[PDB]
């Protein structure tokens with residue numbers, strides 16, 4: 057009726073007539089989405105087709121949370137929901153959901169390819185830190201931040217696609233993707249997490265921008281773990297006492313590394329060179345890299361203190377940082393229910409807007 061279906065993008069896509077010229081922009085990140093032009097609002101918009109959201113229990117939990125969270129999150133550095141629609145008119149035959157949001161030119165991974173400058177790099181990192189603070193403002197910790205979860209436009213405006221792994225494993229189900237490269241020590245040691253875990257992830261991304269490759273490439277679960285202490289250093293005794301016994305020895309049992317200093321791990325040579333100012337802000341980069349790339353969680357730099365760091369404080373505007381916190385309605389965002397009950401609630405979620 058008011059919907060038309062397109063067969064390109066390797067699947068039948070049924071959209072409102074407002075969106076036309078559907079062009080596939082899908083990739084390795086969770087889900088396959090395409091690009092289209094929304095005539096009514098005169099803006100190009102990316103649309104995602106969620107296949108079988110209630111197919112299984114874990115599918116619904118990830119589809120349900122992101123749907124309620126992106127609906128009620130209002131931030132420049134977090135992607136937002138413009139319109140939500142489903143072609144089916146029946147809950148009984150309800151099958152698929154489509155998500156539309158502001159289209160962006162590329163992901164962080166692509167921008168990492170092009171080596172950048174201090175002024176642009178600081179702005180990219182600054183935006184990520186304000187997004188985390190807004191999420192931590194509502195009590196949300198992502199624990200899955202990665203260069204493929206982060207999208208940017210050509211004016212270097214940064215947005216975050218995923219809302220995290222929620223509450224919890226390095227062997228997740230089909231909707232999730234493990235992506236262990238940018239994970240913290242606590243995520244791999246099962247010791248527990250607080251809000252400073254995300255600081256670790258941006259540290260690996262910032263180092264990846266400078267170095268040009270993944271800082272800690274691990275073949276398996278703990279090859280990453282060996283990679284971390286190989287360069288940063290062996291954790292000092294106070295940290296090793298508090299881990300649970302079964303892996304506490306294993307941390308102690310493996311070969312000890314003194315570790316490399318950040319000075320030669322991140323040398324000034326690749327940084328911008330003939331400048332002093334870039335060389336000085338290279339000193340501003342390494343000092344903060346020191347404060348976030350510490351395996352000990354409790355004395356890690358926080359995002360609030362990271363946001364007021366001289367490297368990042370230059371862009372400090374309270375609009376992005378000291379924003380009003382988001383409230384989530386889903387009070388039981390801590391629970392699971394029936395597959396059929398899962399299907400009905402997301403159906404009610406999509407249909408009231």
Ligand SMILES: *[C@H]1[C@H](C(=O)Nc2cccc(C(=O)Nc3ccc(Nc4nccc(-c5cccnc5)n4)c(C)c3)c2)C(=O)CC[C@]1(C)C(=O)OC
Pocket residue numbers: 081082083084085086087088089102104157158159160161162163165166203204207217
């Ligand atoms: C990074 C890198 C890599 O392979 N990445 C890569 C390579 C080629 C093309 C792309 C790409 O398509 N990028 C891209 C284009 C357009 C958009 N636009 C956009 N806007 C809003 C929302 C979305 C969206 C929403 C949900 C799902 N997908 C997209 N898109 C975007 C976001 C991106 C990307 C490598 O060489 C190594 C592998 C990396 C890490 C990678 O990307 O792995 C998949």
